[PDB]
Amino acid sequence: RQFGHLTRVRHVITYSLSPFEQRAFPHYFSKGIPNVLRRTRACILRVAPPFVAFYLVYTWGTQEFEKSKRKNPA
Amino acid sequence: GAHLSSPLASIAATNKLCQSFQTFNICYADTGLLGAHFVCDHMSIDDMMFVLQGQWMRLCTSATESEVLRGKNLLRNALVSHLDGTTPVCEDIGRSLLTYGRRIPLAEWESRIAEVDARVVREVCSKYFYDQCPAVAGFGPIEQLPDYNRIRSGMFWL
Amino acid sequence: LMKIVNNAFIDLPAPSNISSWWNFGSLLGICLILQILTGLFLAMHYTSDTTTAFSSVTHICRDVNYGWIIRYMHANGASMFFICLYMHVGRGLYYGSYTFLETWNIGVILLLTVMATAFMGYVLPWGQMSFWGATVITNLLSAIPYIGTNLVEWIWGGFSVDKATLTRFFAFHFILPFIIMAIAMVHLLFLHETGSNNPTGISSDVDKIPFHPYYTIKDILGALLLILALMLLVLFAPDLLGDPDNYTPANPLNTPPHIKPEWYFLFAYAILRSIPNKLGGVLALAFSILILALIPLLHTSKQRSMMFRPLSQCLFWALVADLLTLTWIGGQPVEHPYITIGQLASVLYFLLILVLMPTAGTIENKLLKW
Amino acid sequence: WLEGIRKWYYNAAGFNKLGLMRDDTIHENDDVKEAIRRLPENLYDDRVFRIKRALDLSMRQQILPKEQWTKYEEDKSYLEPYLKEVIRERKEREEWAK
Amino acid sequence: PTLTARLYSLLFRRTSTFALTIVVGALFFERAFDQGADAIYEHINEGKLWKHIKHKY
Ligand code: HEM
Ligand code: HEM
Ligand SMILES: Cc1nc(CO)c(-c2ccc(Oc3cccc(OC(F)(F)F)c3)cc2)c(O)c1Cl
């Protein structure tokens, strides 16, 4: 497979520029970092909470393990 | 057909890659446009462009003197045969007096041409083709038309 | 003229919307070559005999001119291998690539090839975990009825691991990556009939582009970070992942208190360790892997991706936790606080795959009327 | 109450933040390739451009502004007539074989 | 012209030169980078290395 018989396009226009005629990293700090946040807010809720719970079962799993080795009053 | 001289033609006749193409040279006040126009079936664009770019690099690098005298002798039979009548003349006048200033008597063009040898071409084409930042246009089934980067990477031999 | 096949690798159509995730799909081409390249020079000095092997390792780590590196570019390199996989395998789940049914199944046989290779690769130097790590894993096949004792004796060349069982691996182990090197080419061939599979899930045929300028350098950039995050281990912390015991010579009359194979089994080792029964836990293990072949018969949503399925996102990364749990829970000994977690987590693994990920699309189809 | 949830899920899936519609994102199979072949030009090219820009913005990880987003009431189900037409023929083609 | 443009038309234009440039710069670069790290490494570990205890014995 290759270019030439993939599929159909009609009445679409493309505007593209050389790289030499433009900076490589325009608005890297300005527009990116707000876009990092918006990128972040849209994933954080359904990514962490499992890993959040993991921090607790890595927490309680060791604490409850430590106690079991300490003697009892008997 | 195949027996033509310009390699770009004999190939396109041999392999039937295209249907028509022409070069040009447009010239404006302190700049111009140098390049070409070509028309071909969608399954053959990328092949033509490699050949075209192959020739420019060939001319900027290895311009055989025997191939120069052709184009010199071709050009003479343009300006002359162009000036077979009055209307072509009166264009060249009315266009000369706003572009160059003085009209140029044709024995002046001829002297300028005979200065041209294969050493000059390798300098000129180096200045205006090699590694430059071309401009590209497209209108049609161009599914095979390569990206701008691939065009420029194909601009310099080696 | 055969160069024209590298239309596949030069003028190939591929999308433009592509993340840096798919670099991981390419690094294995580097890791596979990088590992063999290292391991080859490495194995110019290894010896397939017991009495000299552990010395024949230290013959490298001490006396050879920069031979000490090659052990660790190889070893930890074998771990950066997996770190790409378990981001590369989790990918197609999260972007719906398993639909390429002819390809995903190949993605299994590469894995099982490795998880029986890398195993052989840990046991060569007789690190006192080599031996028992060879014993614990290999003995499980004895669980089978009427053939278990026969095969394991047959692969033990006798009755337990010994000089013969070393050498039966060093040849089985120095060969298979080539079988991976070949099957990898197959893994790309079935792809080339369809090309990649965007994050969206949509046929981006309208927006396919070349490969020589764009994804090449991106892959190099991907490769550059790999070497970086591989030089750090070897240069600054080679003792990190590999358990320390592997520098002790091996002795069948002395076990360590705690045993674990290398860290990467642990998502799967723990599953067996949860089940107190012997056999019935094994078939969970092999099913803990081959389940990936069972997924494409469980693609419910008439969408493909999970970028556009926020509910399944909540369940996908959830699975990553359970793995990151089972990766660790197996790494710790057998005591009451943890066993209660393995009985849950291992069930959660099978549960999230076979019940709820279908159930999401069964719903999400209905929230949007198809 | 239900319908307050469909409108919400459709906002959380993301694919209104990319100028897309619902039929755009469907898994492509033989059943669907039939329908996309059967569409008219005016609507077909209108499918293409919705995709062709969403890709370029899933490249950048950028989106459209809030105004140009898609709206649930405007989530036109342009494909459903052409699709269910097919699977009618499919099950007519199968049960006729039994 | 800037240094950059003066640098382009001399070296980075003709590919035959562009490869000649790199080995040259690399050949000298090997001579500096080693001296740098070997001294920084010496400096940070001052009073620890063999060459620092090479006179006593
Ligand atoms: C995916 C392929 C492979 C994996 C996963 C793998 C696994 C391993 C591992 C984990 C070690 C750790 C030993 C240590 O750190 O001390 C090792 C060592 C070794 N590898 Fe492999 N290996 C692979 C392929 C190879 C190849 C391709 C070669 C040779 C070309 C090779 C030859 C050796 C030898 C001789 C040793 C002993 C050195 C040692 O134990 O440190 N292996 N291998
Ligand atoms: C040495 C082992 C492997 C090599 C060399 C390899 C190589 C590749 C490469 C180069 C790609 C294209 C890059 C990409 O699509 O992201 C790819 C894609 C893929 N690989 Fe791997 N792979 C290996 C192991 C695996 C494994 C273990 C799986 C497990 C399922 C797998 C499943 C896939 C799938 C499903 C794709 C689909 C591509 C797409 O969705 O566009 N591969 N593989
Ligand atoms: C989309 C996409 N497609 C392809 C191939 O279709 C590739 C791709 C490109 C080149 C490839 O060639 C290689 C390079 C090094 C090792 C390698 O292993 C080997 F050789 F099979 F062992 C294959 C292999 C895969 C890719 O990196 C991406 Cl991102």
Instruction: Give the other-Cβ count within 10 Å of C275's Cβ.
Output: 17
B97, B137, C357, E26 from D52: Cα distances, Å: 50, 20, 29, 45
β-strands B36-40, B18-23 pairing: antiparallel
Check: CB of residue B154 under 8 Å from CB of residue B55: no
Residue A55 sits at the vertex; the CA angle it makes with C340 and C90, to the nearest 5 degrees, is: 85
- Nearest CA residue ID for atom 28, ligand 2: C107
**Do residue C193 and residue A6 have CB atoms under 8 angstroms apart?**
no
Cα torsion C262, C268, C270, C275: sign: negative
Q: Is C288 exposed, middle or buried (0-12, 13-18, 19+ CB in 10 A)?
A: buried
Instruction: Give the other-Cβ count within 10 Å of C361's Cβ.
Output: 19
Q: Does E15 touch chain B (CB under 8 A)?
A: yes
For chain A, the C-alpha Rg in angstroms (whole number) is 27
- Distance, CA of A67 to chain centre: 38
Q: Is C133 in the pocket of ligand 1 (CB under 6 A)?
A: no
Phi, psi of B20 (to 5 degrees): -170, 150
Give the Å distance between the CA of C121 and the centre of ligand 1: 4
Q: Is B36 helix (H, G, I), strand (E, B) or coil?
A: strand
| DSSP state string for chain A | --TTSS----S-------STTS-SSTTTTTTHHHHHHHHHHTTGGGTHHHHHHHHHHHHHHHHHHHHHHSPP--
DSSP C201: -
Check: CB of residue C311 under 8 Å from CB of residue C363: yes
Check: CB of residue A50 under 8 Å from CB of residue C320: yes
Cα torsion E15, E21, E24, E30: sign: negative
C336 is in an annotated binding site: no
Distance (Å, whole) CA C24 – CA C215:
12
Distance from CA of A18 to the nearest CA of B (A): 7
β-strands B31-33, B18-23 pairing: unpaired
Q: Is B38 helix (H, G, I), strand (E, B) or coil?
A: strand
Give the Å distance between the CA of C330 and the centre of ligand 1: 23
DSSP E13: S
| DSSP state string for chain D | --HHHHHHHHHHSSTTTTS--TGGGPPP-HHHHHHHHHS-HHHHHHHHHHHHHHHHHHHHT----TTTS--GGG----SHHHHHHHHHHHHHHHHTT-
Closest CA to A1 of B144, D46, C315: B144
Q: Is E2 helix (H, G, I), strand (E, B) or coil?
A: coil
Q: Does B148 touch chain A (CB under 8 A)?
A: yes
| Tokens representing residue C82 in the block | 């997996």
Q: Is C103 in the pocket of ligand 3 (CB under 6 A)?
A: no
Phi, psi of C27 (to 5 degrees): -65, -25
Q: Is C4 exposed, middle or buried (0-12, 13-18, 19+ CB in 10 A)?
A: exposed
Distance (Å, whole) CA C105 – CA C2:
29
Residues of C in contact with A6 (CB under 8 A): 13, 205-206, 208
Closest CA to D22 of C115, B124, C368, B131: C368
Distance (Å, whole) CA C279 – CA C285:
10
In one-letter notation, the amino acid at residue C266 is L
**CB burial readout C243-252, b (16+ within 10 A) else e:** bebbbeebee
D26, D28, D88 from D85: Cα distances, Å: 17, 17, 5
Technique used by the depositors: cryo-EM
**Do residue E15 and residue B156 have CB atoms under 8 angstroms apart?**
yes
Cα torsion C231, C232, C235, C241: sign: negative
Given the CA of residue C21, which atom of ligand 2 is nearest to it? 16
Q: Is C118 in the pocket of ligand 1 (CB under 6 A)?
A: yes
Residues of C in contact with D5 (CB under 8 A): 367
Check: CB of residue B1 under 8 Å from CB of residue B14: yes
| Tokens representing residue D51 in the block | 């995709």
Contact call for E and B: 3+ CB–CB distances under 8 Å: yes
**Do residue B156 and residue E16 have CB atoms under 8 angstroms apart?**
no
- Nearest CA residue ID for atom 16, ligand 3: C29
Give the Å distance between the CA of C303 and the centre of ligand 2: 21
Give the Å distance between the CA of C296 and the centre of ligand 2: 16
**Do residue A11 and residue D45 have CB atoms under 8 angstroms apart?**
yes
Phi, psi of C61 (to 5 degrees): -65, -15
Q: Which domains does chain C have, with CATH numbers?
A: 1-370 (1.20.810.10)
| Tokens representing residue B104 in the block | 């140029």
**Do residue E13 and residue B158 have CB atoms under 8 angstroms apart?**
no
Provide the CATH topology of domain A1-74.
1.20.5
A41, B64, B79, E43, E50 from A47: Cα distances, Å: 11, 67, 74, 46, 52
- Residues of C annotated catalytic, as ranges: 192, 196, 218-219, 262
A60, E28, E31, E38 from E34: Cα distances, Å: 51, 10, 6, 6
Alpha helices in chain E (DSSP H): 3-7, 15-44
Resolution (A): 4.1
Cα torsion C303, C307, C309, C315: sign: positive
Phi, psi of C331 (to 5 degrees): -70, -10
Q: Which domains does chain E have, with CATH numbers?
A: 1-57 (1.20.5.260)
| DSSP state string for C315-336 | HHHHHHHHHHHHHHHTTS---H
Distance (Å, whole) CA E18 – CA A40:
43
| Domain spans, chain B | 1-156
Distance (Å, whole) CA B71 – CA B77:
10
Beta carbons within 8 Å of D17's beta carbon, 6+ residues apart: D63, D64, D69
Let me know if domain B1-156 sits in CATH 2.40.10.120: no
Beta carbons within 8 Å of B35's beta carbon, 6+ residues apart: B23, B24, B134, B135
Residues of C in contact with B147 (CB under 8 A): 209-210, 213
Phi, psi of C209 (to 5 degrees): -140, 175
Long-range contacts of A55-58, Cβ-Cβ distance < 8 Å, separation of 24 or more:
A57/C325, A57/C341, A58/C328
Contact call for C and A: 3+ CB–CB distances under 8 Å: yes
Q: Which domains does chain D have, with CATH numbers?
A: 1-98 (1.10.1090.10)
Question: Which chains neighbour B (Cβ–Cβ under 8 Å, 3 or more pairs)?
Answer: A, C, E
| Domain spans, chain A | 1-74
Helix (H) or strand (E) segment spanning residue E52: none
Instruction: Give the other-Cβ count within 10 Å of C304's Cβ.
Output: 25
Q: Is B20 helix (H, G, I), strand (E, B) or coil?
A: strand
| Tokens representing residue C46 in the block | 């290894």
